[PDB]
Design a protein around this ligand. Sequence first.
Ligand SMILES: O=c1ccn([C@@H]2O[C@H](COP(=O)(O)OP(=O)(O)O)[C@@H](O)[C@H]2O)c(=O)[nH]1
Ligand SMILES: O=c1ccn([C@@H]2O[C@H](COP(=O)(O)OP(=O)(O)O)[C@@H](O)[C@H]2O)c(=O)[nH]1
Ligand SMILES: OC[C@H]1O[C@@H](O)[C@H](O)[C@@H](O)[C@H]1O
Ligand SMILES: OC[C@H]1O[C@@H](O)[C@H](O)[C@@H](O)[C@H]1O
Ligand SMILES: [Mn+2]
Ligand SMILES: [Mn+2]
Lengths: 282, 282
Amino acid sequence: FMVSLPRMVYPQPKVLTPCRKDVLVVTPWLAPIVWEGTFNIDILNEQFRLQNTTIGLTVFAIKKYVAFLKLFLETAEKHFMVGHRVHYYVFTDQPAAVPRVTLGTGRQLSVLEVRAYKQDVSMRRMEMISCERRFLSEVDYLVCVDVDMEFRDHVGVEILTPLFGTLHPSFYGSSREAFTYERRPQSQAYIPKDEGDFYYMGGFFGGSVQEVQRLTRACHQAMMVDQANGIEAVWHDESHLNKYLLRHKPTKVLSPEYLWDQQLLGWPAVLRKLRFTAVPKN
Amino acid sequence: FMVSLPRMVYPQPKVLTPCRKDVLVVTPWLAPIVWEGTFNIDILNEQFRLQNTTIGLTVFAIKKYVAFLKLFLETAEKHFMVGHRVHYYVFTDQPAAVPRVTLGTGRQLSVLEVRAYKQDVSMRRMEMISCERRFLSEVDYLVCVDVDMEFRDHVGVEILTPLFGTLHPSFYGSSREAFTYERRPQSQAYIPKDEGDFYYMGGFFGGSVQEVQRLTRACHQAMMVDQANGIEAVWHDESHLNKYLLRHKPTKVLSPEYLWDQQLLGWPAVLRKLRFTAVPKN
Ligand SMILES: O=c1ccn([C@@H]2O[C@H](COP(=O)(O)OP(=O)(O)O)[C@@H](O)[C@H]2O)c(=O)[nH]1
Ligand SMILES: O=c1ccn([C@@H]2O[C@H](COP(=O)(O)OP(=O)(O)O)[C@@H](O)[C@H]2O)c(=O)[nH]1
Ligand SMILES: OC[C@H]1O[C@@H](O)[C@H](O)[C@@H](O)[C@H]1O
Ligand SMILES: OC[C@H]1O[C@@H](O)[C@H](O)[C@@H](O)[C@H]1O
Ligand SMILES: [Mn+2]
Ligand SMILES: [Mn+2]
């Protein structure tokens, strides 16, 4: 049950003025595409706080990638769901290498030890995410991200929805035939040249716990099939995520504001904010 | 559980071209505003058929308004949720005056006899809608409309969502201070001049059965309070609907395509289609 919003004073939305005219702000299946200027964060904050929403954030830091956790977590503290309940889940082969990061109130961190693999590290995240009962008991939404990243600006409840993917920053202006989907029919991830909505980035997806369990289960089952058949998708888990989201349309799509690489792509005018960005690495 | 969509061939959405640049297509709380050009109905049809969705449509035809049912129902047959399961619920004081209208397969009609009131006819719909157990057993969504209307074009599953309202065709270009909300603080429907997103039309709202029961319960309770206090809102149930939807934001908003009056307002260029329209009356 959702109680009433309180009185709020904010600018009237005007139907005969769009804020954003430069970009597509809704998918053809009526999912919002989240850009700056499309949301009033005060209204969304009220809505989600009235539900006491808890957001879980998963991150893998295996082998040398433990080095990325300090900046990841410190900047998450500045920018990620501030004001909301947050539970970080750090999956690592080196529990003792997890930095001691000071958290704001209502935020917690759990360290989950996993085995290190010798592509497989990236690909095994789906299996490892699909800690199932734990998440259902502890959080409302799961957000699943790469560790070699930093938050530079607001990443908040505007992302939350049953199922979301993020537009890959190298492909948002590309035609579908250019997308690097898996193109071999022998793979479970196969997508023909005349199919596809978007090319989603494997490093930032999420949703409700139920929908995230569904996705990671389906992608892990599809990768197992490929394994059995002696085929490895061109972009590993990302290929499978793309096949899933083609057949199960996300209920929001995040703009490239939410997964950017300023060294490789600069700062185009279409991006008002650079919210979550790649950290330079070998 | 939602099974996979089948392969489909359709135009790629392009992120750096919006279809609609002339109008706001998403609210500041990230609800789509449904205009022609914003949706691919093939994708939406697939999604909703995979769920075997059943849509209930409520209409009141009391006293002389029974005359409007033939055209209402015949045009609903041509345009309303065609291909989906539909259950019409016709609330009337004259069961024998309900015309015999031939229905397509998978569609049914029930006649529910009510008492006629001597404003009260309009206002009592909320109470009468909130047949509660019946709807929960028989339909997935409820759509609640005025009878003095005709379908002229497609009205389909693009509307379905947990909770929707429709932009009133006289006010979609107006500033909020011009909206005819109830302005007396003594009414439960009161909305101050600096509040309000939109002015929703009382003649077309809906949602999931749960959310529609919530709305009609809340509006009926608020009208009872007003009654007890000797105040009748300026626009009756519509005033209360507007207060509800201010405090409980709809998950889609329908454009004025979905409730138009061509005699009073013509056919502006911003309306690509006129889908559900007023029938001329005294
Ligand atoms: O040795 C490794 C390789 C990968 N990863 C995790 O897998 C994610 C995906 O790998 P990576 O970021 O290297 O892919 P890229 O973004 O360079 O294509 C990383 O962010 C880490 O979260 C890891 O923890 N250790
Ligand atoms: O005598 C009446 C008055 C109203 N209504 C029902 O209440 C709705 C709202 O009334 P009306 O359409 O007259 O409001 P208007 O659109 O003229 O302001 C009507 O469409 C009918 O569905 C009715 O059935 N009989
Ligand atoms: O073409 C797909 C690839 O594009 C790269 O820019 C990215 O580093 C890879 O991880 C993969 O997403
Ligand atoms: O101002 C509100 C009113 O606007 C009229 O156009 C309509 O006929 C009324 O039923 C009411 O909605
Ligand atoms: Mn990465
Ligand atoms: Mn009417």
